[model samples]
Target: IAGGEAITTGGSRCSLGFNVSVNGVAHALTAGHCTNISASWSIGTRTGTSFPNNDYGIIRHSNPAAADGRVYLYNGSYQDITTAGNAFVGQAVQRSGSTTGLRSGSVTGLNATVNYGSSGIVYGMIQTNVCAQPGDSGGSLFAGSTALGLTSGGSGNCRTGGTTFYQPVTEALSAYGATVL
Candidate 1:
């Protein structure tokens, strides 16, 4: 129902990024990689997507009752996500996903790039100490209530405490012509 919560396609599970809208039409944001899984999800259908060169996806909602603008912290309380902003090096951050729940760290670098062999290389990433896992992809990365990025991939970052990559969410919002709820 919120960021960091479960949303699936087929038999695979992934995290939701954020709730957004265009012209008052409700949609959800997630990683383009995850969105590439298919055009439909448990809560909606894929409306737009991008990957490889960039990572972001949009889904037009089908369940109005499931629509919300907060990130589930997995602590019984939800964090209100009101804005999407750029992150800076050394900035404290938190990530939430189905695999790792909630994890905290800091921005390590910016405009980072990672080559995933056949998976394609992503650019203009937000590198962080915050950890995430495979199923955590598309989860929320935030500083307080300000939305920052989406869980792109983790090199044992959230799992073993190393470096993780995130897709800058501003790009996603801009590309889709939507705003965060």
Candidate 2:
């Protein structure tokens, strides 16, 4: 799920997330903000696409190899990513994204409120010092390999340190009825 090349927009590198498929149709789940900018997206070109809904989107393109059905997770444990649930405070977790790669953290808060400015209000999030960036949005946050949430917003960087808010993967998936690939 981590190898679809890097996506770019406005001369900035847009991070990539795991690609999944339902019934063989390819889809990539990422931040709604990223998908809102474009109806479609690409890894390096026009091969990737995104749609904004339920705080997530999917990327589909002409590149068959890039469109493989799979949700890439830390390690090789599919159960960790497939479980439908939310993360509790103090839960150990990890995140995966093209920009941040793999990193570990803990759930610091739950049901947190975050204002995405123009993106409107986003609620019921888990806060952590997991550290993420603009391109890192839509990445996976896992609690002991069990999918916890989706990277949404925060302030700070992995270098100088930052706070990242995650949209509970189960909540988003349930609202959309999407299964993690």
Candidate 3:
């Protein structure tokens, strides 16, 4: 499965962040808050999760080969992700999620922080103008072929346009010992 696709757990839906591998083991990343709802995913069980403080989680793919390193473009094609990188202010980026399909925006800030009330504060987020919805959580945020961030939380809906924040993919990879496949 590719990033931006739907992932279900405990009857709740969220978007997959990216397909990755840890020490040759296949895994998929998503928003930690999504995993906080249930440790089991549609395809696999949660292996690790860092929520509230961070905002990322890992699901070990039951069938390693079933995971692919790509992001769905909402059409019939996909974007191959060969590497992960950091986002810069003013960088043009695109986000894909089950709720909104695809949306384009620019990075507005770096090392940003967001407080999701009871969910606590998340620091070092990549702030962008991209609009996303509820089910869009854990979606992919990319710039070209590079994987950038995981959709976290935002202020408004895609209809009216609003700010969005993403957890840097590199930080998630580092924390989980995973590499973008």
Candidate 4:
């Protein structure tokens, strides 16, 4: 439904990125790496995914009405997402995931490239000080009501501290021909 909710398919789970639409057709966005594990999402079927070079995926929802353009606060509330945009360095942001709930931080860099060993390299990522865990992948990263990025990968846990990378939402939306709802 909303961003940060847990989505399961093929026995693996990951966080939803955002609710989007293309040509009036509803879809949800997530990490391509997550879709790489399977061709379907709990709410829909995977339609497009771009991993290695980028880390974004789109799922065509079976029930378009189920797609809600909002972010879960993990506090019985939701934040309305009005637009998708690029992240700037030092911009205050928050990340929501199934594993860590919600975490706040600032963007630290742009055009970052991460090498996930055999999984390959992802370029033009937004680097942040936010920490994320296993199930956090594909979660939403937002600043106010603006959708910023999708959780890609990172090092460390919320217990301590760590750096995280995000695939810009603008790029993902453009690639998938989707717009924020």
How would you encode candidate 1's per-residue C-alpha lDDT over 81-124 as one tens digit per residue?
A: 98999999999999999988999999999999988789899999
Clashing pairs in model 2, backbone N/Cα/C closer than 3 A: 41-48, 41-49, 49-59, 80-145
lDDT of 1: 0.90
lDDT of 3: 0.93
TM-score of each model, paired residue for residue: 0.97, 0.75, 0.98, 0.98
Identify the runs in model 1 with alpha carbons over 4 angstroms from their true place: 157-159
Error of 3 at 167 (Å): 0.4
Better-scoring candidate (lDDT), 2 or 3: 3
TM-score of 2: 0.75
| Span of ten consecutive residues with least summed lDDT in model 1 | 154-163
Model 1 residue 102 distance off true place after TM-score fit, in angstroms: 0.4
> Which candidate comes out best when scored by lDDT?
4
* Model 1: per-residue Cα lDDT at residue 140: 94
Count of clashes, each model: 2, 4, 0, 0
Question: Which residue runs of candidate 3 sit more than 4 Å off their true CA positions?
Answer: none
